[PDB]
Design a protein around this ligand. Structure first.
Ligand SMILES: Nc1ncnc2c1ncn2[C@@H]1O[C@H](COP(=O)(O)OP(=O)(O)OC[C@H]2O[C@H](O)[C@H](O)[C@@H]2O)[C@@H](O)[C@H]1O
Ligand SMILES: Cn1cnc(C[C@H](N)C(=O)O)c1
Ligand SMILES: [Zn+2]
Length: 282
């Protein structure tokens, strides 16, 4: 807890110049077009533009702690809106260009964005989600579950059980949920493209899952302002705000970023919606 290694914090930000940034996002568009199975890996950097601080950025939770300062929230978890990046990920799954989505984020924004829970692994848990110890039935609440560390919330199961509801928020020593890690690992291994967005990739095994794509000739794209553990293994590193990257990419793919209708929970993905025909590439 007090001793827990919080990794490299507050490393300097990298900004690709405008010409290099556009070339790289056109290369990312080329990679998504060519790839059969695209897996996205998200961390705290995809929520910074909705007022939720990350952990290891210049004003990260751990970075600020290291300097004896406090992280700053510009939102509650309840009033936080999915970013352009969150909504881009919704659309990419809908049109069948996203196979699976692996997130380290506990902020609940993927679920609340309307992203289908059967194509999502929430490796570190979800602050709005509590789970019955007896029957493992999960509840997606409209308010944050008041506890962290897999503790009793004080509510009981209502399945046709009265089992003790517990939060899904892993503490440092807790291993990943077997179901989410198993599906995330399978998805990453089989992927021919793994794209990382606002994660420094410093937490095992979460941060390592993109590397699994590299086995069998898979391609790895890392989008991050700061350096990441696995920068040297990337076929492409894009240093820029994830919203600028994802909005340019969606424009290149000929996709609109959909409207958020407010907080909505989707258990199961649908068959793909129509998508634009693919460019002639080579
Ligand atoms: N708008 C942005 N655009 C691009 N990159 C961004 C942006 N905002 C921040 N970043 C980058 O986003 C990156 C976020 O890196 P980290 O802060 O380590 O978050 P994690 O999700 O990988 O942390 C994993 C676990 O560690 C914790 O203990 C928890 O348990 C987490 O679940 C930084 O490098 C920023 O440069
Ligand atoms: C944030 N976090 C919590 N637990 C983890 C996984 C941890 N490295 C383990 O497997 O034991 C990450
Ligand atoms: Zn139950």
């Amino acid at each position: 807890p007090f001793t827990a290694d919080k990794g490299k914090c507050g490393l300097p930000e990298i900004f690709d110049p405008p010409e290099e940034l556009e070339r790289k996002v056109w290369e990312l568009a080329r990679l998504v077009w060519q790839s059969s199975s695209v897996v996205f890996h998200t961390g705290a950097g995809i929520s910074t533009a909705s007022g939720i601080p990350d952990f290891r950025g210049p004003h990260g939770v751990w970075t600020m702690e290291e300097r004896g300062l406090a992280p700053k929230f510009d939102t509650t978890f309840e009033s936080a809106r999915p970013t352009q990046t969150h909504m881009a990920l919704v659309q990419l799954e809908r049109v069948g260009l996203l196979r699976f989505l692996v997130s380290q984020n506990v902020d609940g924004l993927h679920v609340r964005s309307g992203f289908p829970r059967d194509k999502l692994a929430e490796l570190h848990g979800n602050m709005f989600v509590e789970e019955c110890a007896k029957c493992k039935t999960q509840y997606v609440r409209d308010t944050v579950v008041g506890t962290m560390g897999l503790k009793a919330t004080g509510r009981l199961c209502t399945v046709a059980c009265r089992g003790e509801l517990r939060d899904t928020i892993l503490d440092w020593e807790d291993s990943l949920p077997d179901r989410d890690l198993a599906l995330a690992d399978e998805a990453s291994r089989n992927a021919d493209l793994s794209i990382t967005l606002g994660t420094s990739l410093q937490i095992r095994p979460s941060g390592n899952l993109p590397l699994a794509t590299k086995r069998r000739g898979g391609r790895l794209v890392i989008v991050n302002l700061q350096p990441t553990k696995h920068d040297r293994h990337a076929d492409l590193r894009i240093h820029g705000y994830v919203d600028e990257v994802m909005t340019r990419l969606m424009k290149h793919l000929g996709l609109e970023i959909p409207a958020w209708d407010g907080p909505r929970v989707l258990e199961r993905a649908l068959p793909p919606l129509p998508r634009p025909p693919t460019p002639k590439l080579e």
